[PDB]
């Protein structure tokens, strides 16, 4: 009988039950969405979008509802921190329930199509055999796709009839859902320009409508029909898989590098913002401005928003996790409570020293303090007996500006080293490790997990493409080669052109 | 030299439904006590 | 709630093991 890895081939010539199976799959996916959202809602803490945003909590579908304009709960909270709000029916809960109802309705439709598989629609009128006109189906479906793509850009994203999409400033401080105007010039291809996302869906949507109309009205050329086996639904599977793995690689890359569709308030910072000290430069810029206008050190650092300081911390860097370190980032370093303040180190002669920051590659990193010119002035030594740069010998002290510890200085060497070990991670925070029994080991963000899963699926779907493409082009020998294959046909020089019996010599 | 005493076993679909119902309802009853 | 952690696996196996037994018997009844 059929081997276990071929059971679903019984659908290849059964359009009705093919539709039934596809309905069942669609029911299961929508049901997952509903279930996942409800789970996230039952576990989400909305009380601090500054130091406990969704992406510190292991939220995965919540950011995707928020990205397109769903921002509040029937319980009265919203993800931007606003309180006493009425989101209407399209709250997180209502989106979840819509997907569960959709899943139930698809399930019932699947039953009907499985039972009533023998629909005359599926039969070729001339030959009475089941047949699908795949070229025209493609045109119909493409036209539909074009209409939705256009509608989604023209109405939802613009706010013409819809909410807009998540947009924010360059440092992820003031994000919100806002209507977005199309960017029609060359900056529309800038991945960080939200207006280009609007123009893309309007432009491509029209192209899809036009191409849809073309593919409904114009038959494929005979040369192309035969070359691509357009009478064989498995050629569609092969090329659909190729399109899908291509799309999967693109969304993995834009998640990892960042774009206007992967904002940092929904998914967390990228690793490159750590590599380039992106938030630290902005922080220093603001402090220098406060210092330029005559504010004191304490005032300049106290003006630094905690949200910005929390971005300048390697624990939110997505390249710091591990494959089997599970759960939300809060399970690792803990639930962030407060910015402790900016630590300033000085040696016995009053030079400001700078802790060398941990690079993402390193699970552990030594504690090395440098001056403005990069000359090493203090460290925590491994071998003590020939130490020249100990905190004890160099009289290193730490003072804090802004934050919880503002205006405090510590001089006892073990406390000073303790903060120096934290400073290799960037800005220093007070964490609650008891509530979640946090184990102290960095985990990755939803940006990291999403990228991993989609790059791995994309690679595996490459093999699916190769497999089903091979099966499409080599259908005739799937079960084996011709038992009467002529030895003159595979030996050399019998034919002028390989495999062409009309070129015999 | 096969054994003459062998017999096929049967479970009809109705018995499967009844049996699945017994197990699920027993699980629903005792699960609270298992979690305690 | 501070429930017994082994209650999940106990419940899970309570369902799975006898259910699988019945399913095995039923499917082989159908194929003969």
């Amino acid at each position: 009988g059929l081997p276990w890895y071929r059971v679903h081939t019984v659908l290849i010539n059964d359009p009705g039950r093919l539709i039934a199976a596809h309905l069942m799959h669609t029911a299961l996916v929508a049901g997952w969405a509903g279930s996942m959202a409800l789970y996230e809602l039952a576990t989400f803490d909305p009380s601090d979008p500054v130091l406990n945003p969704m992406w510190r909590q292991g939220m995965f579908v919540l950011p995707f509802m928020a990205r397109l304009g769903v921002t509040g709960s029937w319980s009265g909270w919203s993800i931007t921190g606003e309180t006493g709000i009425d989101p209407g029916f399209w709250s997180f809960e209502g989106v979840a329930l819509a997907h569960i109802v959709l899943s139930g309705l698809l399930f019932l439709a699947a039953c009907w199509h499985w039972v009533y598989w023998d629909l005359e629609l599926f039969r070729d009128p001339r030959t009475g055999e089941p047949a699908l006109d795949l070229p025209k189906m493609f045109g119909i479906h493409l036209f539909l796709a074009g209409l939705l793509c256009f509608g989604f850009g023209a109405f939802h994203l613009t706010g013409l009839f819809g909410p807009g999409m998540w947009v924010s400033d360059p440092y992820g401080l003031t994000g919100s859902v806002q209507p977005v105007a199309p960017e029609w010039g060359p900056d529309g291809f800038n991945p960080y320009n939200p207006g280009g996302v609007v123009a893309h869906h309007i432009a491509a949507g029209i192209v899809g409508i036009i191409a849809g109309l073309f593919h409904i009205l114009v038959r494929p050329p005979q040369r192309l029909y035969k070359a691509l086996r357009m009478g064989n639904i498995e050629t569609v599977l092969s090329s659909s898989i190729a399109a899908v793995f291509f799309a999967a690689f693109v969304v993995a890359g834009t998640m990892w590098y960042g774009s206007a569709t992967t904002p940092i308030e929904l998914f967390g910072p990228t690793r490159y913002q750590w590599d380039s000290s992106y938030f630290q430069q902005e922080i220093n810029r603001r402090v220098q401005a406060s210092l330029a206008s005559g504010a004191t050190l304490e005032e300049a650092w106290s003006a630094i928003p905690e949200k910005l300081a929390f971005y300048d911390y390697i624990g939110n860097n997505p390249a710091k996790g591990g494959l089997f370190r599970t759960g939300p980032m809060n399970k690792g370093d803990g639930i962030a409570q407060a910015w402790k303040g900016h630590a300033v180190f000085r040696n016995k002669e009053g030079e400001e020293l700078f802790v060398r920051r941990m690079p993402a590659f390193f699970e552990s990193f030594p504690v090395i303090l440098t001056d403005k010119n990069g000359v090493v002035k203090a460290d925590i030594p491994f071998r003590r007996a020939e130490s020249k740069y100990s905190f004890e010998q160099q009289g290193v002290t730490v003072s804090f500006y802004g934050g919880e510890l503002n205006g405090q200085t510590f001089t006892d060497p073990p406390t000073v080293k303790s903060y120096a070990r934290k400073a290799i991670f960037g800005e220093i925070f007070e964490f609650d490790t008891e509530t979640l029994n946090s184990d102290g080991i960095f985990r990755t963000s939803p940006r990291g997990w999403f990228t991993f899963a989609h790059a791995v699926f994309a690679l595996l779907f490459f093999f699916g493409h190769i497999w089903h493409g091979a099966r499409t082009l080599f259908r005739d020998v799937f079960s084996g080669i011709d038992p009467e294959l002529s030895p003159e046909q595979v030996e050399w020089g019998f034919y002028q052109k390989v495999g062409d019996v009309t070129t015999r010599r | 030299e096969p054994n003459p005493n062998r017999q096929p076993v049967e479970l009809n679909r109705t018995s499967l439904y009844l049996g699945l119902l017994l197990i699920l309802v027993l699980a629903l009853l005792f699960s609270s006590y298992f979690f305690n | 709630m501070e429930v017994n952690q082994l209650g999940l696996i106990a419940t899970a196996l309570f369902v799975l093991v006898p259910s699988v037994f019945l399913i095995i018997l039923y499917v082989q009844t159908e194929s003969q």
Partner: peptide
């Protein structure tokens, strides 16, 4: 986890109701 377990079991039972009714062995006059 316990809430999920109770609801999972309850949901399987409703699914069983559907099959027991609509996919029964039909009673035939034999």
């Amino acid at each position: 986890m316990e809430t999920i377990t109770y609801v999972f079991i309850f949901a399987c039972i409703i699914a069983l109701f559907f099959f027991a009714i609509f996919f029964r062995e039909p009673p035939r006059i034999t």
